[PDB]
Amino acid sequence: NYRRYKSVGIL
């Protein structure tokens, strides 16, 4: 998931 801001690992 319900989170909309992202950390770098999502890449």
Next chain:
Amino acid sequence: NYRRYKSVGI
């Protein structure tokens, strides 16, 4: 996946 034919599951 390589195979193109499907089973019922997916």
Next chain:
Amino acid sequence: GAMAMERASLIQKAKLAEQAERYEDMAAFMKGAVEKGEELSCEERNLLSVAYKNVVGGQRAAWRVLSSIEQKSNEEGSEEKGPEVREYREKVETELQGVCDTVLGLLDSHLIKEAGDAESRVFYLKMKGDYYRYLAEVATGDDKKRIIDSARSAYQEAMDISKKEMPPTNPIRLGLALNFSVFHYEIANSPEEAISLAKTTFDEAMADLHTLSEDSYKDSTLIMQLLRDNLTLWTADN
């Protein structure tokens, strides 16, 4: 009483594990629920199948990736090749065989029975054939022969029940013939039987489509499209 409470808790955790995409946990929870001794409703049956299908499904995919790498590595394309690809493809194999073995054991000890409606009996015998088929995908030599025989036997007993007690448009009967035709084509190297069974299943159900409600039409057609797609690929060419 205690049994019902404990069974209800296991079914509940299986649904939680489904939402969390924890399918190994989901399979374990449903295995435990089965071992409580009561028959599985239609909904519960699907939970069991979904759980183990995702578990073995990931293993089949991983096995296919590693096998493909193994072939290129063993063809001198990668040149110097070590044993790591084989060792890891064998570990994934052993893990997959263990899950299939667990599923087949549960089917024989708790789920496959002489009593029960036709859908349930067909559902589990089809499941037995599917997981012998998954073992066949990774088997070799004599073991492959025995496993292929066990698969055909399970599929055939499910076919006999579905053709006797279910109409040509029953989604479980359709799914069974679909998977049995896949077995014919991929495992038994019998494309003529695969095409014949798939063609017969589609046509015999096509004739009964007008007798189905709006929902049953969608459920039955959803699987008929899988049959037609396989036929197009099998008939058009190799």
Next chain:
Amino acid sequence: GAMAMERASLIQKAKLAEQAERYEDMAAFMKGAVEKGEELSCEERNLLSVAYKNVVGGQRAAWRVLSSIEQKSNEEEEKGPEVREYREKVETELQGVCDTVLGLLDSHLIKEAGDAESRVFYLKMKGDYYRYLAEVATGDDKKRIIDSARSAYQEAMDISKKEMPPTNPIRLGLALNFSVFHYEIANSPEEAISLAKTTFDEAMADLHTLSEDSYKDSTLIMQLLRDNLTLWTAD
């Protein structure tokens, strides 16, 4: 040999696991490679990071789903302790993986020596996995965990701002994750917005000088920084 070949084997099996999306096995193999004592190359560092990222990734997502259900249990139903028990089981698995990563960072990877890239890489990673523990911590242990995460990020920050350009992908990724820490963990939305904006602004001023090697990498992180700012600022 006994180590050199075993290490090479574990590395090759880690690459095979990645292709097969067997991230738990991958994590195991790379952990085995680390324990051989030799330092990790850039490629090997990424294998380690990608492996454990996916492992805790699934656990975190699972934990989030179960927590949301647990929080809405008494609202409507579920009623029983099943959600809590299973959430605590997932939570415990997650903490075990984080503890394995952090233990490997302090034991083998974090060194006073080495280039700035590797040092910032592992200190960032240390902050990341303390941050993951903070996501699930509840009480006094949380404060210590938060502080441990901040100290690891801050040490990585000091090194990055001293030895790497503002467009360096590792620096940008560190700043991004540290701003997420400020916003989500520390609950300091002003610092997060400020850090993200400063990071993006100073990177933008040097983008014309950025090499094609890091063009795509830095660009992607900059898009993330700006995406978070658009969200944090509007609300």
